[model samples]
Target: WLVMLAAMWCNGSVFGIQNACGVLFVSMLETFGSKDDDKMVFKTAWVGSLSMGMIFFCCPIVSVFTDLFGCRKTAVVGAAVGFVGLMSSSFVSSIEPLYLTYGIIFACGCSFAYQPSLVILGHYFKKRLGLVNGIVTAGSSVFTILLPLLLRVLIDSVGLFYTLRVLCIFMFVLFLAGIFNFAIFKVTAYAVWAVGIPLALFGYFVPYVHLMKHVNERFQDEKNKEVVLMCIGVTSGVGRLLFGRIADYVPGVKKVYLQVLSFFFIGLMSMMIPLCSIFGALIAVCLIMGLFDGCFISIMAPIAFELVGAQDVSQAIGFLLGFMSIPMTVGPPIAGLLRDKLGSYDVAFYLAGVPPLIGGAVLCFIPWI
Candidate 1:
């Protein structure tokens, strides 16, 4: 249990860095020396998308390591690599260097650390899979709550280069403590469901990377921007805890149906974001979306377990996530293009929203019940 807690903390801190990329997103536009906002949007979005997509894209490799080297060694090695990547990022003079260091190498290290923790998690908990996964996954949200503010403040005070150095040091400590601790599948039965994931996930991260920037355009106050982002973290944390408990009691099909509803509503909420011109209205919109976002994230692992069985959990997760990475990688760039063409984020929001709406409808045919 103690080791599990350490592993959970590792999961949280790694993801905290990933989720906090939005803070960096705002800073990077200026750092990158790009005058075209639209082009910069496409370039910067890739940094976050790459970090996120690698979480899934590298799962096959992660699983291979867990299988061959064991979770402890794999996690340590990943942490070391992540540390190197982050530290190296501090020295880059151009945004292109960032794509290689932070985008790929750091993200790759995160994948190695991320998947092994999940593997360890499945081994540690059985009957309470839904609840425990929720608890552990919520670790990221906990970090999310603080990370953006931390990075934003640090960037303001110390500048971007030093900020990366500090974060690298922090991650090094997290990995060391994690080293002290340590750390699934189905096929066709999950294929239909897996097929829907990419679409559902297409819009999943748009808000994370762009929401603050979106709102910042309307309201110049940094504090207001921080408030909306923190609201997302708070509600998402609450929703994960709430939905995990609900999934434990709800019938399997019903739980899946709820997930469908959650995805659908995510799209709906995103589409409405541009309509909320007032600060309070915008905050309300994000809070509601965050809840549904939490629901989908919390139940994913448990749902996979139901479809694939414990013995096959690793293979199932790797297959599902690895396949989904394609869309996750491309989705942000598409959204960026829409922003460029439309000359505003409003249409971009709508474009991002449509995929999950379609994805949700596709899941209706799954017959998981």
Candidate 2:
């Protein structure tokens, strides 16, 4: 169980970094602000993309090493690399350096570290994988809540440089925890990437890209934003718990996710959709979207395990979600550009919605499921 704790904590920390607002993006926008400037625009667009790219790209690389070495060592190296990269980001002054430090280097290190721990996670549990994954996956929400506040306190109390240095130290401690202990019993080869990767890429992007952006626009305030994210987190936790139970109870659990994805789309359209700026309308959407979003993450892994089998689920999870990193990387930036080009986020929402719709259709084609 010690190793499991380490692995989960490692995931939690890296997940925190990814979700945690990187100082560089906001810093870049503040550094170069022009309405028509594509440089600023592109930087905004690419920041999300690059971060996702690093996480997705690095997972396979780390997985290969995980195969050669083991989860404990792989996790340690990955965390250390991320710590260095994140810390280096504070020193960067310009966009170029920002991309290299925060976007490329930091992203790559985080990518490497992120999924190897999940691979270790897959190694340990089978029957309880759903609940285990849900509980650990919930850590991202915890980080999401904490990291920003922590970053803010650090920045306010000690400035960006010292704060990041402090985070690096904290990450180093987490890295030690990741390496020194773990609960995963063993590793094994899962299914080939053909099925898992594409589906994961499709599913993860569906909720994250479209719904999240939509919710943000519908309820345009910091309080609302927190409410929306928290709603999503809570709903996600519920969805995870429900799906986790369902996957264990029934056969063809993978197939059920298709229906769930359909509900996700329906929820996107239905759940107190904001026609105007009323708190009630916004809150309703928040409640609906949150449930769906959380559910999506909850069900994602169990479906993969069902489709790929438990033994190889780690590799399957790694590769499949790795593909998801692409959309995650690209989605927000493209959405940002869309917001810029159209002077509204509505188009981006439509575009984001389409992927999941098509993705659901694609899942319908799964002969095995």
In terms of lDDT, the best-performing candidate is 1
Residue-pair clashes per prediction, in order, are: 5, 14
List runs of model 2 lying over 4 Å from the truth: 20-28, 35-39, 119-134, 151-166, 179-224, 257-263, 266-276, 309-311, 367-369
Q: Find the 10 residues in a row with the least total lDDT in model 2.
A: 180-189
Candidate 2 lDDT over 1-369, as tens digits, reads 646566556766666555544343443454556766654544654754576677776776777777788877877787787788888877866556666776677777776676666666655656676557666766656655555566656655777567667878767876777621122212221232233334334324333333444444455454533354445456655666666566465556445454446445643554224343676565566566656655565555666676556765666566655566666676566656666687665665555544555545545544442
- Give residue 232's error in model 1 in angstroms: 1.2
What TM-score quantifies how close candidate 2 is to the native fold?
0.77
User: For model 2, what is the alpha-carbon lDDT of residue 124?
Assistant: 64
- In lDDT terms, how accurate is model 1? 0.77
| Alpha-carbon shift of residue 50 in model 1 (angstroms) | 1.4
Q: After superposition, how far is residue 62 of candidate 1 from its true place, in Å?
A: 0.7
How would you encode candidate 1's per-residue C-alpha lDDT over 106-160 as one tens digit per residue? Answer: 8888788766676666566467665566666676688778778888889889999
